[PDB]
Amino acid sequence: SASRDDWRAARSMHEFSAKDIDGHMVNLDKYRGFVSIVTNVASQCGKTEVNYTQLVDLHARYAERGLRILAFPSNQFGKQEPGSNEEIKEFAAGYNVKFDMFSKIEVNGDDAHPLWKWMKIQPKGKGILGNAIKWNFTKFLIDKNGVVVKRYGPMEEPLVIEKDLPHYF
């Protein structure tokens, strides 16, 4: 509010950019034409295993249809992502991740990545008790035009997204 918030006027996830887990700046317009799941991850949560395994399942099954997964580590929830980006990359490799890992970010507060600020105010990005990210492994499903079409909370295992994603290919 006192901060610059021209991010509010973006019309698509595809307008944004973010550093990948190796520190390289990626323009998210590469996802034009691809159904995407954007999620915040952490390594030291009780549901880390179920989330990583099922995200890998989704990518393995649907990458050929155009499914992409953008995983943003964050240490904002119980300090459950204390590692460096290199350590997080290695952790993801242990789950045979082949989707897109990003550098660690904040997802809540004034210093959150602006993509996350933007997703949280979208009509289909609404949370329950306000729009803040509540814990690790929130998921946003994004259509081929970069519009948010659904939000899933931490406790919704990634395979629940499988019911919805085929409508957007």
Binding site: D6, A9, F16, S17
Partner: peptide, 13 residues
């Protein structure tokens, strides 16, 4: 740039 994050432009014109 419409939104900076750390040392890069997170939302280009």
């Amino acid at each position: 740039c419409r939104a900076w994050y750390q040392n890069y432009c997170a939302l280009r014109r």
